Design an enzyme around this catalytic site. Structure first.
Site, mmCIF file in Angstrom:
data_model
loop_
_atom_site.group_PDB
_atom_site.id
_atom_site.type_symbol
_atom_site.label_atom_id
_atom_site.label_comp_id
_atom_site.label_asym_id
_atom_site.label_seq_id
_atom_site.Cartn_x
_atom_site.Cartn_y
_atom_site.Cartn_z
ATOM 1 N N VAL D 62 -3.856 -3.417 1.564
ATOM 2 C CA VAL D 62 -5.208 -3.176 2.060
ATOM 3 C C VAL D 62 -6.184 -2.729 0.977
ATOM 4 O O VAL D 62 -7.294 -3.253 0.880
ATOM 5 C CB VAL D 62 -5.210 -2.118 3.187
ATOM 6 C CG1 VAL D 62 -6.624 -1.921 3.712
ATOM 7 C CG2 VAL D 62 -4.287 -2.558 4.313
ATOM 8 N N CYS D 63 -5.769 -1.761 0.167
ATOM 9 C CA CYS D 63 -6.625 -1.248 -0.896
ATOM 10 C C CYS D 63 -7.007 -2.352 -1.889
ATOM 11 O O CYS D 63 -8.137 -2.393 -2.372
ATOM 12 C CB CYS D 63 -5.926 -0.081 -1.612
ATOM 13 S SG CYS D 63 -5.565 1.380 -0.547
ATOM 14 N N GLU D 64 -6.074 -3.252 -2.185
ATOM 15 C CA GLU D 64 -6.357 -4.350 -3.112
ATOM 16 C C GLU D 64 -7.417 -5.273 -2.521
ATOM 17 O O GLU D 64 -8.358 -5.677 -3.204
ATOM 18 C CB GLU D 64 -5.091 -5.162 -3.403
ATOM 19 C CG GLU D 64 -3.928 -4.343 -3.935
ATOM 20 C CD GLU D 64 -2.759 -5.207 -4.370
ATOM 21 O OE1 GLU D 64 -1.685 -4.644 -4.673
ATOM 22 O OE2 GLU D 64 -2.918 -6.446 -4.414
ATOM 23 N N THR D 67 -10.936 -3.668 -2.568
ATOM 24 C CA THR D 67 -11.490 -3.602 -3.914
ATOM 25 C C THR D 67 -12.079 -4.947 -4.341
ATOM 26 O O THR D 67 -13.195 -5.008 -4.859
ATOM 27 C CB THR D 67 -10.413 -3.170 -4.931
ATOM 28 O OG1 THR D 67 -9.831 -1.928 -4.509
ATOM 29 C CG2 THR D 67 -11.031 -2.989 -6.315
#
Lengths: 170, 170, 171, 170
Positions: D62-64, D67
């Site tokens: 998710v974080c990737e 970003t």
């Protein structure tokens, strides 16, 4: 002594946690806590000259004497904010201000965030590890460090006149 | 009798930082600093029963009253090590013991490593964020949490009889 | 060998945060987090020989090489518990293990409590301030530090054989 | 955008460490570290609009995704500095930037001082205690918080469009 990465404690070397702050560097902001448990920001650029005094503890003889001194010496001086910061909890600092009439300087605690590590005065070894070294910083209105004084021996008082004279030229 | 994730401060709830400990869990070791600046380990397994009492600050009314109380009730007991832990610096705790003749229990500061966060009593919000809530833990000789008590209201005193009775059983 | 209060980073001296540990001292307990986000306790007295290896970061070539080498030489050894510790978050350590197939040793993170400061390996100055220096500790069954090796330069690898031989000596 | 004192992890509530930042508050400064190991200051007043995006870890799916997404919608937008902050060490963020061509946003680590606790996004309980919750902050040129968005479900992406529309008004 004036500025370094190590100081002495009763003659024995004590290393400090970096970074070493130098004249011209931006003064880091430190979110400290006053005796009424309110937070205040020291450092950074303000419309006044700032004098940040770090001491190991207001519950110790030298630190007590030093704070009383600056409280008297900076009295009446306008255009400057003086803050004595330590790792003492706000409760000890409140007690200190009740015992002694301190009204020309503000005492604050760095227990919550330990932002003074950003000033290079956090002690990194020995009996006082985690406590602040005795130093004085003067910040100009641009938020830059204009003066630094790291007392070479923690049990010794700082040079008071060197500090007042620098504040005067600012 | 049971820990929780929130405590009240004058009726208003404040959240605690985890983890929440429970009877049966291994007691985390906390490296604290005594008034003579020596480090001491509380928690873990020792050849004696350990009573760990956390308080917000010895420089406050209730904590003072609580510490004096435990000092009296725990006097003369063998086979047990009682330590009152707070975030007060050793200097304040040193002054506290010089003003109230506390010699039946030990006082220690968790300012250096803040290991009591491991006991789930670190306050995570409000004016007292970063300070320890009021609680009592009893650790058996095997290093396991045998009893826990979290005072529901920070301004309240704990149940002393409950603690004494459990220590006698261990 | 002997511990020290300073190490070099690319030739430049950097001080470490105290206290300095010595052989014979009780090994402090460190609450670290494994790749599955569970907490493990290293140090203290256990009914097994403990090997604690600290590194700056598993996401750097030197630390990866060191970890693979220790994983190899400790393969199948009985009576020992080897843990590689760094300030890397568990998420990075998990990806590392998956990519380098590390199964003989445990990797764990000290990000939560930074307990390894108690071992005198927390870097106190320079670009790596707040990171762990490269060192090796061997703890005996009594919970005492039986061996210590502080690599004099962060970019250098440790002396592997010396560690292995000591572990064997302790059984 | 909305702010709170808790976030959910798959529908299960996890408390955050205070304080809660609100629109109108001065944006605290956070001393973070970039992939080149240099220190950068986010927050406070700058001559550009600031978009501070906190995430649990860039080493998660998710974080990737988030970003890369922000690095897309904020492209070509002049007068605005976008920084993605997490507790990942700089080494992981460097590896992240070498794997994914990111040239419209700066990634930085808060591992050194954990200053983002001042933004009220530090997780205080559960398996993720110690890392940052997913949130987005927008700081105006006067250094005041002009927008706040705390993703209610930490495992989900934030609402992108409302962020880009607010920065334009500023």
């Amino acid at each position: 002594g004036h500025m370094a990465r190590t100081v002495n404690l009763k003659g024995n070397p004590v290393t400090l946690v970096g970074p070493e702050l130098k004249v011209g560097d931006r003064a880091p902001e430190a979110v400290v806590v006053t005796k009424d448990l309110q937070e205040k920001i020291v450092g950074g650029a303000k419309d006044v000259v700032q004098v940040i005094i770090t001491v190991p503890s207001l519950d110790t003889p030298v630190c007590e004497t030093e704070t009383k001194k600056f409280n008297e010496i900076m009295a009446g001086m306008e255009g400057v904010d003086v803050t004595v910061v330590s790792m003492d909890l706000p409760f000890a600092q409140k007690r200190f201000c009740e015992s002694f009439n301190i009204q020309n300087v503000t005492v604050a605690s760095d227990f919550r965030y330990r932002d003074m590590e950003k000033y290079g005065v956090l002690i990194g070894e020995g009996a006082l590890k985690g406590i602040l070294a005795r130093a004085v910083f003067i910040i100009d209105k641009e938020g830059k460090v204009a003066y630094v004084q790291l007392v070479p021996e923690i049990t010794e008082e700082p040079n008071y006149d060197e500090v007042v004279n620098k504040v005067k030229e600012l």
